[PDB]
Design a protein around this ligand. Structure first.
Ligand SMILES: CCCCCCCCCCCCCC(=O)OC[C@H](COP(=O)(O)OCC[N+](C)(C)C)OC(=O)CCCCCCCCCCCCC
Ligand SMILES: CCCCCCCCCCCCCC(=O)OC[C@H](COP(=O)(O)OCC[N+](C)(C)C)OC(=O)CCCCCCCCCCCCC
Ligand SMILES: CCCCCCCCCCCCCC(=O)OC[C@H](COP(=O)(O)OCC[N+](C)(C)C)OC(=O)CCCCCCCCCCCCC
Ligand SMILES: CCCCCCCCCCCCCC(=O)OC[C@H](COP(=O)(O)OCC[N+](C)(C)C)OC(=O)CCCCCCCCCCCCC
Ligand SMILES: CCCCCCCCCCCCCC(=O)OC[C@H](COP(=O)(O)OCC[N+](C)(C)C)OC(=O)CCCCCCCCCCCCC
Ligand SMILES: CCCCCCCCCCCCCC(=O)OC[C@H](COP(=O)(O)OCC[N+](C)(C)C)OC(=O)CCCCCCCCCCCCC
Ligand SMILES: CCCCCCCCCCCCCC(=O)OC[C@H](COP(=O)(O)OCC[N+](C)(C)C)OC(=O)CCCCCCCCCCCCC
Ligand SMILES: CCCCCCCCCCCCCC(=O)OC[C@H](COP(=O)(O)OCC[N+](C)(C)C)OC(=O)CCCCCCCCCCCCC
Ligand SMILES: CCCCCCCCCCCCCC(=O)OC[C@H](COP(=O)(O)OCC[N+](C)(C)C)OC(=O)CCCCCCCCCCCCC
Ligand SMILES: CCCCCCCCCCCCCC(=O)OC[C@H](COP(=O)(O)OCC[N+](C)(C)C)OC(=O)CCCCCCCCCCCCC
Ligand SMILES: CCCCCCCCCCCCCC(=O)OC[C@H](COP(=O)(O)OCC[N+](C)(C)C)OC(=O)CCCCCCCCCCCCC
Ligand SMILES: CCCCCCCCCCCCCC(=O)OC[C@H](COP(=O)(O)OCC[N+](C)(C)C)OC(=O)CCCCCCCCCCCCC
Ligand SMILES: CCCCCCCCCCCCCC(=O)OC[C@H](COP(=O)(O)OCC[N+](C)(C)C)OC(=O)CCCCCCCCCCCCC
Ligand code: NA
Ligand code: NA
Ligand code: NA
Ligand code: NA
Ligand code: NA
Ligand code: NA
Ligand code: NA
Ligand code: NA
Lengths: 221, 221, 221, 221
């Protein structure tokens, strides 16, 4: 019977039907946002959702027999697998984080549809030639996060009280968001030389970012 | 008589006259801004405006006889047509949006003048090789807008109470405007892990923008 | 005697002496910033300044005889000329704007020193192949400035009350500075669809900027 | 005995041991951040730290005998030397800046590990072909800092009262952070034409940054 199901799974109908459900489930997910819609067509949509996930677990099961070991060596299938399993976890229990991560299954639209695969693939293939710079950056943040924590955390707990708060804050400074009016001007009211820490930080982190972007421009070319 | 008008329309004088009215109408539109100017030369300018639009409907009518089917297959002509038709709708009725969309006819300066067409054309031709990325991005926002709405909308209605509000807020975050001091620091006062949602969002959305620009740099070359 | 002065003007000493005064005057200008320095060495520096400008008017006069018509066809000489004339206007009278524009003479360091000329020249030569885009942008701003003025100026005078205030505000939105928390969120409290005006504005203006930068990247390459 | 130590120092074990201590010290530096961890394992970590720095002074001393004059002509060795010497200065005395600059020794991970050297080297080699532009920029800030100080410092001391304050504020404006809502809108309430100073400043400074990046894009290619 292997070939009988294999010709189902491999068919255009099968794929088109799945893509059809993605778009349908996607639309219905946005409708579940409205409190109004849910007081009317609430149960309609709730049952519709348990229907789709069933059709998708079957689909994933059918796909696995047809592909066996090849399935679990396909990034796109693994994604499909993990995103459907997330969606499988019971409505209650633990936390509702899982209930929300369910919406991630709309990314199956990238999986099921080629051309989307193409862009995602292109975007991703750029990432390996970045990891050395990313690593450098992460070491850099880690070193300045520790300095900021022990230089400013006592008198500025919310922003630098903790290694994590300092990472967060340093990230924010990197995006240049309120770095002066909101963080460094207030800091200087106690520590007039705080600028000797953040200006060089901003220069480096910006300089790197420019280089990182240049990398992708030159390397893709 | 066809050719008699065709030599009018196709002439150098004709175009130069029209461009002359654009610049004249454009200048007059900026003066209609001054409350002072309107209490003096109010009626002067109001009559001048109904005159020009008449001259432009004639022009569009003349252009259509001379070009017929070719006219409505010319992007620039269509623009000219639609931007003049907007301007034709009566002074009152419905809303005053139409009175304002009238000023869009100054983009007729781009139509009437070559060299302008060229740059607009150059800018636009870049857009097809972007739609896959734009599509990816739009799906991306939609998935995160839905997550944010159901994760933050209850306790943060202004920013995430509604799918549209979440789209808006997520857009703002993408521009990096006040994303931390204005949105994510407040959110974390209730949801200490909100940062697990917005930092990866900012990374992805930034990464893409960088790639999108790299695309245009490499692809234009 | 022409050649006698021409060999003075053309000498290394002459140029080196002038550059020496630039750096000296530049340093002294920063010292004139200190209220403390001026209560001590105030008169020392004040006389020193009238000395230098004299040496520079002579220099410009000497240079003109040696170059005649060629002088006033040299951008760098013209700059040198106009920046020294600004500096010549009496200490009082009219406004003190002139007293401040004097510091612009430190840009003579770019003039007098080659290599600086080289970078400035390189930076400038890029500008012609931008003017079509700049023109487009300026028309664009002008059209949206007028729309914003008549859509938001009544209820938001500070930001859109006037064509100029609208230009200013639209510029600010373009830099993405507080565009949402500071301008468009407040606007939406009265005009819930204000977002239909500013989001498309931001997209266009950003898109253009990206293209403009791409232009310089591809064209220099 | 020279060669006896040279085979120690030059060995694979030796380097691997040192990198092992870097990562160990780095990890331990991040734990010294926790107030909790220090009341427990406080002395454990404090002793561990004086141990490592000893091991590193030995290492630097061993490396110097093996390399002599070549050592102090190696950028990476010099860094190693200076970053370890910082770490040597006694726990108290003067200020605690030295205690903090100690954490800079984690950049030893860049020294000790190849591939890291490569990226740092790649990033740095880009800097020479920038110094002309940096120089132009520095002159530029200096001229405008002086203008801003004497135009705005009297009525706006916090932001422009002093040449250094003006440098700081002008830097912030360059990052575009709150330049309008936070600095130029307030300034205009007293000086309605302040915009004639900051808009052209923002244009020039932005233009240059764009060019500077274009330089690195074209020049790296
Ligand atoms: C690598 C990422 C390291 C992540 C990390 O160390 O966690 C630090 C913080 C979370 O710490 P935490 O203190 O628990 O939470 C923030 C403050 N709170 C409790 C009030 C919400 O979470 C953060 O905000 C850190 C994430 C920003 C730093 C991301 C790494 C930047 C370096 C490389 C990025 C640019 C390279 C292209
Ligand atoms: C890799 C480059 C970036 C690394 C640069 C790190 C430099 C850190 C700058 C210090 C910023 C503020 C730190 C600070 O503690 O505040 C200023 C202190 C004065 O306060 P402090 O003495 O700490 O005691 C606090 C008492 N209170 C609350 C009443 C002020 O007094 C000072 O801290 C003065 C600091 C001036 C010397 C710093 C210049 C050294 C640059 C590093 C050179 C080697 C690496 C490149
Ligand atoms: C490639 C094309 C790009 C065009 C470049 C755009 C440059 C436009 C600069 C206009 C900026 C002036 C705005 C301003 O100063 O405040 C707004 C004022 C309102 O002041 P207000 O006190 O209410 O009354 C003015 C009194 N009056 C009429 C006797 C002068 O109201 C006015 O000033 C109205 C002045 C409007 C003149 C605009 C002329 C631009 C030519 C347009 C060329 C293309 C047309 C399609
Ligand atoms: C700042 C942007 C404002 C836009 C001004 C609005 C006026 C433009 C209306 C439509 C213009 C169509 C431009 C265009 O490239 O046509 C699309 C393609 C290429 O045309 P092509 O045949 O190359 O001439 O076929
Ligand atoms: C390349 C980069 C491209 C990025 C692609 C994503 C761009 C999305 C831009 C978001 C635009 C936006 O602000 O959405 C607002 C609309 C209106 O929803 P609405 O709740 O009516 O208005 C929100 C503001 N309010 C409540 C105070 C009036 O909310 C909606 O209706 C959502 C539909 C907009 C999606 C358009 C995407 C094409
Ligand atoms: C898997 C791909 C599927 C793509 C299909 C997406 C098409 C639209 C989805 C359905 C959204 C329905 C609109 C909606 O939920 O209204 C929410 C609020 C009004 O709620 P409310 O009146 O407060 O009810 C109580 O009103 C709003 O917040 C504004 C309405 C939101 C605009 C809809 C956003 C469409 C984005 C386009 C995504 C394209 C992906 C390729
Ligand atoms: C590679 C990226 C790494 C992250 C991927 C997923 C990792 C999942 C970690 C999540 C674990 C912690 C999240 C969590 O506990 O939920 C926190 C809240 C839900 O409310 P909750 O904190 O339980 O209620 C406290 C407030 N109260 C008591 C006053 C009601 O809701 C929140 O704000 C959580 C923040 C959202 C993050 C949860 C995952 C969404 C991220 C999906 C996209 C990530 C990149 C693609
Ligand atoms: C072309 C520039 C046109 C300049 C112009 O129209 O003047 C408008 C305003 C000054 O008007 P004004 O209302 O007198 O002053 C601002 C408000 N106030 C009185 C409270 C200080 O001054 C401005 O802020 C306008 C300058 C920003 C617009 C600059 C032009 C942007 C389009 C092209 C830039 C990007 C192309 C690469
Ligand atoms: C290529 C290298 C890049 C390295 C990647 C950097 C990622 C580091 C993530 C650290 C973020 C965690 C920060 C955080 O959660 O809050 C700060 C806490 C303070 O909390 P606290 O309540 O005060 O006490 C902690 C209790 N304890 C010790 C028993 C666990 O204090 C701590 O959590 C201290 C934890 C520090 C562990 C850091 C390990 C990073 C390895 C460094 C590798 C390179 C070394 C040269
Ligand atoms: C995020 C940046 C942090 C920097 C970490 C600090 C450690 C680096 C210290 C000095 C590194 C010298 C790097 C360098 O490229 O040497 C300068 C040139 C090229 O060396 P090369 O001979 O190519 O090897 O001769
Ligand atoms: C490529 C792009 C490169 C851009 C070149 C321009 C970068 C200039 C960055 C400005 C850095 C800066 O914040 O200057 C501050 C210093 C300290 O002056 P100071 O008045 O002591 O400190 C100001 C803050 N306060 C009063 C609250 C303590 O003020 C000064 O001492 C000015 C000397 C800094 C010039 C360094 C330029 C190299
Ligand atoms: C034509 C090229 C000439 C380049 C030479 C520039 C060298 C430095 C110029 C002299 C600046 C003297 C420092 C100064 O004025 O102190 C001002 C305030 C303290 O004033 P204060 O104590 O309040 O007196 C009352 O304290 C401060 O605000 C901090 C001190 C300002 C740092 C000096 C900025 C140097 C920038 C480097 C420019 C390089 C151009 C290639
Ligand atoms: C191509 C760029 C075009 C601009 C180039 C130069 C054009 C010169 C136009 C200046 C004419 C108007 C300036 C002016 O009136 O001075 C305004 C104030 C001085 O105080 P003032 O307004 O007289 O006092 C009123 C306040 N009160 C009564 C309470 C004391 O001080 C100010 O805030 C004026 C704002 C500074 C602009 C003056 C020129 C400096 C720009 C130099 C760099 C421009 C680009 C390189
Ligand atoms: Na301030
Ligand atoms: Na703050
Ligand atoms: Na805060
Ligand atoms: Na807020
Ligand atoms: Na808000
Ligand atoms: Na506001
Ligand atoms: Na305001
Ligand atoms: Na302020």
């Amino acid at each position: 019977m292997y070939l009988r199901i294999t010709n189902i799974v491999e068919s255009s109908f099968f794929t088109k039907f799945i893509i059809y459900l993605i778009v349908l489930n996607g639309i219905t997910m946005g409708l579940e946002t409205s409190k109004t819609f849910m007081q009317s067509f609430g149960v309609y949509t709730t049952l519709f959702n348990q229907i789709v996930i069933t059709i998708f677990t079957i689909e994933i099961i059918l796909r696995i027999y047809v592909h066996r070991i090849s399935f679990f060596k396909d990034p796109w299938s693994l994604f499909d697998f993990f995103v459907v399993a997330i969606s499988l976890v019971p409505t209650s229990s633990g936390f509702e984080i899982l209930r929300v991560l369910g919406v991630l299954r709309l990314f199956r639209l990238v999986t099921a549809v080629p051309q989307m695969r193409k862009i995602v693939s292109a975007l991703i293939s750029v990432i390996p030639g970045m990891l050395s710079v990313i690593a450098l950056m992460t070491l850099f943040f880690y070193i300045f996060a520790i300095m900021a924590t022990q230089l400013f955390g006592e008198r500025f707990p919310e922003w630098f009280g903790t290694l994590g708060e300092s990472f967060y804050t340093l990230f924010q400074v990197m995006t240049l968001e309120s770095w002066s009016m909101g963080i460094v001007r207030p800091l200087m009211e106690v520590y007039p030389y705080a600028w000797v820490f953040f200006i060089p930080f901003i220069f480096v982190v910006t300089f790197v970012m420019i280089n990182l972007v240049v990398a992708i421009c030159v390397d893709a070319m």
